[PDB]
CSV table of C-alpha atoms in Angstrom, one decimal:
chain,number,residue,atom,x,y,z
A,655,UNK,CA,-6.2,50.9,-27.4
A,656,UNK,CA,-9.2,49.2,-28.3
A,657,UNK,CA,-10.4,48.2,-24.9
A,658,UNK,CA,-14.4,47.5,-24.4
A,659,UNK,CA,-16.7,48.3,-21.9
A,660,UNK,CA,-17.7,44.8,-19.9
A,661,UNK,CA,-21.2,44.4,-19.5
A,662,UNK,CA,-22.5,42.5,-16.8
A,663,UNK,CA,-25.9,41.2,-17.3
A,664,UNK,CA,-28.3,38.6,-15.7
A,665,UNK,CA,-27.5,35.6,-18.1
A,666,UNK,CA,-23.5,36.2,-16.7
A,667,UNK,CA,-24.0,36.4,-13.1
A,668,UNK,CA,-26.4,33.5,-13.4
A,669,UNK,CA,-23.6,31.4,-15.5
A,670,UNK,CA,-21.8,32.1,-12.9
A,671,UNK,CA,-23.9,31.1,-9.9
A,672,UNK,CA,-24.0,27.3,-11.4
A,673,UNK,CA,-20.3,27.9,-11.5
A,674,UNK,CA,-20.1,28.8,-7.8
A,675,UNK,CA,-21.7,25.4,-6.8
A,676,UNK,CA,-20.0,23.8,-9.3
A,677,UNK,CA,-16.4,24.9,-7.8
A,678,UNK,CA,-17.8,24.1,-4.4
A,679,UNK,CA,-18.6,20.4,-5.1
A,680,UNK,CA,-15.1,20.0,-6.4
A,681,UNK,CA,-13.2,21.7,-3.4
A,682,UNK,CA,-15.2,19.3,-1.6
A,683,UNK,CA,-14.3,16.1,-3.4
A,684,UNK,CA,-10.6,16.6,-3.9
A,685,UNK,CA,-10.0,17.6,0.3
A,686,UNK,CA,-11.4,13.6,0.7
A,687,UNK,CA,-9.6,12.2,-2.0
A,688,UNK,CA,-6.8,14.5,0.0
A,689,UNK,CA,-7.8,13.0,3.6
A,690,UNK,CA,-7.9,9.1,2.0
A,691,UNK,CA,-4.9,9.8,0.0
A,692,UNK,CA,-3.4,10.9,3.1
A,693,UNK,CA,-4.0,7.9,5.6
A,694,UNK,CA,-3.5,4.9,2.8
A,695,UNK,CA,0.4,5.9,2.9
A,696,UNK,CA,0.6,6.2,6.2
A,697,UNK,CA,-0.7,2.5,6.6
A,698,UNK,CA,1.1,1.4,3.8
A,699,UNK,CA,4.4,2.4,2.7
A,700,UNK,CA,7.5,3.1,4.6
A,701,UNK,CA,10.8,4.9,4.2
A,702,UNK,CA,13.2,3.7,1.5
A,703,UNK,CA,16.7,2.8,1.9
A,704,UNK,CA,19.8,2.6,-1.0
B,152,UNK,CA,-16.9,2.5,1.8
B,153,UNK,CA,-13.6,4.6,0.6
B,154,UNK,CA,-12.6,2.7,4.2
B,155,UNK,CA,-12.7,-0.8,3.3
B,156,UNK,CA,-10.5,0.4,0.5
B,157,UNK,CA,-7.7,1.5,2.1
B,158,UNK,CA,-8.1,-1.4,4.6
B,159,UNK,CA,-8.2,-3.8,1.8
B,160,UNK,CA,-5.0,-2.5,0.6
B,161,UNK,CA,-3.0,-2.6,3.4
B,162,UNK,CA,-4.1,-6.2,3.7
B,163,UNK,CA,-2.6,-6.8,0.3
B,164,UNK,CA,0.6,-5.6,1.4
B,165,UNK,CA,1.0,-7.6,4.6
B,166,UNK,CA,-0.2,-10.9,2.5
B,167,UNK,CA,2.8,-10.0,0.5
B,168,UNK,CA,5.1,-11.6,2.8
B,169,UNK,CA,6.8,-14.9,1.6
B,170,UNK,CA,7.0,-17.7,3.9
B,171,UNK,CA,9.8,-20.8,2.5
B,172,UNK,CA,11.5,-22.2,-0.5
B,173,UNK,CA,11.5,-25.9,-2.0
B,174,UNK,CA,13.5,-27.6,-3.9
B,175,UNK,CA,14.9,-30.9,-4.9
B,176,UNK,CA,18.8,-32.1,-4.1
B,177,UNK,CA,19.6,-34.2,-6.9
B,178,UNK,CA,23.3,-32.9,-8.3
B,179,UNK,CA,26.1,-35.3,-8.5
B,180,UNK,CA,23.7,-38.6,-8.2
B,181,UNK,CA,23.9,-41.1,-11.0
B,182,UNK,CA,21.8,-44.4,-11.7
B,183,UNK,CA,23.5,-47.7,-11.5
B,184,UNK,CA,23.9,-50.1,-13.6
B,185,UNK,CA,24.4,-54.6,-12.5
B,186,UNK,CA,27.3,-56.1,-14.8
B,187,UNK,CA,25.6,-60.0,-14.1
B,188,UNK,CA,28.7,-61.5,-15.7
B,189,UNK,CA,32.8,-61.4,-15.0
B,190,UNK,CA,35.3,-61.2,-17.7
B,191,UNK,CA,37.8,-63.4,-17.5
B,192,UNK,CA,39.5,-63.8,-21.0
B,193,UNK,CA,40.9,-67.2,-20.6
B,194,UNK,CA,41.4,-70.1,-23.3
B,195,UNK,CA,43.1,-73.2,-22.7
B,196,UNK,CA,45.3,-74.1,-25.9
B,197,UNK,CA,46.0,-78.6,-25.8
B,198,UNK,CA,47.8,-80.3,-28.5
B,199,UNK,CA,46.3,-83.1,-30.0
B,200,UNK,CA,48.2,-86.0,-28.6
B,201,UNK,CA,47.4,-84.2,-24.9
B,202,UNK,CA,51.3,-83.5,-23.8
């Protein structure tokens, strides 16, 4: 009922800019974390029996 | 270096391996002891006059 027109001006879309990078980096550093994650259990473990 | 990591742990695994037990056997041994003298309980019981 009450809804508000969204204004989009340069301090947003250059919030979000640093925000972009910022995302980036992290998709970055988890997908190692990921890959290293990955190949220690692999090397290490094994199946478990009862 | 996230590589010597993950080769560092798996080392620590395989040195988990145990290799033998010792122990000491001494149940059911005792000391001994030396008894230096015999008993014999004896006592020689003469009258006076010897008969």
């Amino acid at each position: 009922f009450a809804l508000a027109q969204i204004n989009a001006d340069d301090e947003f879309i250059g919030a979000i800019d640093k925000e972009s990078a910022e995302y980036l980096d992290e998709y970055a550093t988890l997908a190692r974390d990921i890959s290293n994650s990955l190949t220690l259990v692999k090397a290490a473990f094994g199946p478990l029996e009862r | 270096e996230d590589m010597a990591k993950i080769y560092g742990a798996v080392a620590a695994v395989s040195k988990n391996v145990n290799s033998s037990v010792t122990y000491e056997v001494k149940r059911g041994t005792h000391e001994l002891i030396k008894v230096p003298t015999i008993p014999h309980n004896l006592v020689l019981i003469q009258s006076d006059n010897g008969k």
